[PDB]
């Protein structure tokens, strides 16, 4: 939330020149260079796996990789930061968070108290980092269920979540106020 | 607000002295029924939840009321409806209750019903009334069995 708001091969070339200069500046950078090389190699093969059109494309790709490894201007630091951020944002990691969330909701129905308590508490932390996530209907029904759950621990965790979320975003809190202030008499 | 104040007062009466409420329970529901027939879910649930702590008391009041009313007593049909609705509405938090109730109802049902059917085939508004009684109790058993959806084998396995 604080970051986002054939050319790819040319970018790979540019990053290689950046690191190449930094080899002169400081040792151990050669290891990083070889590591990036291997990672590009395996990523092209793994996308290849999913054909003859991309077969010819990847054989020029991979041959260029072999050549360019054998081959061991003016681009600098911030540029390198933004390029590698972009190329990482292409990788199958930045679009993983969503998946992770789903996993968490599998936990909420379980047969052990402590795990559910801690899950709810960490979720409270999660939402209090990014306040615009109480939109997906499944999480809504989750926090409702846990508000009606049959154990005092998860009950206090849930009410703490809902209260901190209400406190953070000043307006738009009159929609949770009723379900909140119902809960005072909870034994 | 009325019964809110009432029930809160009752829990205060109970929390000190263990036995008291358990002493007068069937007369309770009888007077309640008289009150309702003077006035005109789960109304009786609060007392039922309160008296669930003691295992013997729990078996006791239930067995006494259920058996006395149904088998040989000409209890009011409205009273039977009231008690039946209250029994069905009752929240259950264990497994002893449905098995116990089902077991005893079955036994009495068996003997009484068998006698009834053989005497009617061998042979009557009196028959109409007592038959209405027994059939309502039957339907209670069936509705209960549907509420749990358990096989009669598993129930009869319980002793």
């Amino acid at each position: 939330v604080t970051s986002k708001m054939d050319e790819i091969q040319q970018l790979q070339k540019a990053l290689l020149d950046y690191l190449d200069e930094n080899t002169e500046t400081d040792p151990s950078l050669v290891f990083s260079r070889k590591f990036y090389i291997a990672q590009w190699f395996r990523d092209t093969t793994l996308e290849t796996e999913k054909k003859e059109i991309e077969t010819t494309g990847q054989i020029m790709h991979r041959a260029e990789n072999r050549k360019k490894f054998l081959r061991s201007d003016t681009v600098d630091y911030d540029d390198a930061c933004l390029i590698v951020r972009y190329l990482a944002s292409m990788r199958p990691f930045a679009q993983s968070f969503d998946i992770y969330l789903t996993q968490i909701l599998r936990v909420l129905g379980e047969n052990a108290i402590a795990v559910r308590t801690k899950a709810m508490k960490c979720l409270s932390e999660v939402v209090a980092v990014d306040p615009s996530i109480l939109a997906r209907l499944d999480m809504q029904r989750g926090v409702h269920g846990r508000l009606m759950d049959n154990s005092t621990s998860v009950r206090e965790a849930a009410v703490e979540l809902l209260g901190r979320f209400v406190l953070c975003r000043p307006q738009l809190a009159e929609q949770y106020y009723d379900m909140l202030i119902e809960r005072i008499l909870d034994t | 607000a009325m019964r809110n104040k009432a029930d809160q007062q009752l829990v205060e009466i109970d929390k000190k002295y263990a036995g008291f409420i358990h002493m007068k329970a069937v007369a309770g529901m009888k007077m309640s029924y008289q009150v309702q027939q003077a006035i005109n879910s789960a109304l009786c649930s609060h007392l039922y939840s309160m008296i669930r702590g003691n295992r013997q008391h729990r078996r006791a009041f239930l067995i006494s009321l259920l058996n006395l009313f149904d088998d040989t007593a000409k209890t009011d049909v409205t009273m039977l409806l009231y008690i039946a609705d209250n029994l069905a509405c009752f929240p259950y938090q264990t497994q002893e209750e449905p098995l116990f109730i089902m077991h005893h109802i079955d036994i009495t049902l068996s003997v009484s019903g068998s006698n009834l059917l053989q005497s009617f085939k061998e042979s009557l508004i009196e028959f109409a009334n007592v038959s209405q009684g027994i059939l309502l109790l039957l339907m209670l058993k069936q509705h209960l069995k549907n509420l749990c959806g358990f096989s009669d084998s598993k129930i009869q396995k319980y002793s």
């Binding site: 009606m148 008499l185 | 809160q8």
Partner: peptide, 18 residues
């Protein structure tokens, strides 16, 4: 997902006094 909620409020609903 509605998995395990306590039956109604009777678990925790001590009624309001007057």
């Amino acid at each position: 997902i509605l998995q395990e909620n306590d039956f109604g409020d009777f678990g925790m609903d001590d009624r309001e006094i007057m």
